[PDB]
């Protein structure tokens, strides 16, 4: 690490873009993964005040 403070916090709280295919999937099983990664629940730095959301791109 050792990661000077503002680069470190930028690295921790950054946004990530995700791609998820459709093509013979049920919409609910796509919606579950999209809901988890839109809320940011897949991160251990999660908190509902922290706005730790990610982008989800479904094709």
């Amino acid at each position: 690490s050792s990661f000077s403070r503002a680069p470190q916090q930028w690295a921790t709280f950054a946004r990530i873009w995700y791609l998820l295919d459709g093509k013979m999937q049920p919409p609910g099983k796509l919606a579950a993964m999209a809901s988890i990664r839109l809320q940011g629940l897949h991160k251990p730095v999660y908190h509902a005040l922290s706005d730790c959301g990610d982008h989800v791109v479904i094709m």
Binding site: S4, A11, A14, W17
Partner: protein, 55 residues
């Protein structure tokens, strides 16, 4: 000195030049920067990761 990073006390200006001078002393050739991880180049809040490779 507890809880403070190094360059919060030294406050250098050009770290890459000091780094290539330091590697000039240690007989390691020259660090080339290669792009390692990135997440969103087109937006207004990117994130990059540059790693410095020596040989």
């Amino acid at each position: 000195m507890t809880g403070k990073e190094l360059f919060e006390m030294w406050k250098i200006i050009n770290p890459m030049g000091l780094l290539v001078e330091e590697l000039k002393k240690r007989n390691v050739s020259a660090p080339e920067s290669r792009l390692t991880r990135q997440s969103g180049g087109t937006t207004a809040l990117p994130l990059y990761f540059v790693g410095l490779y020596c040989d």
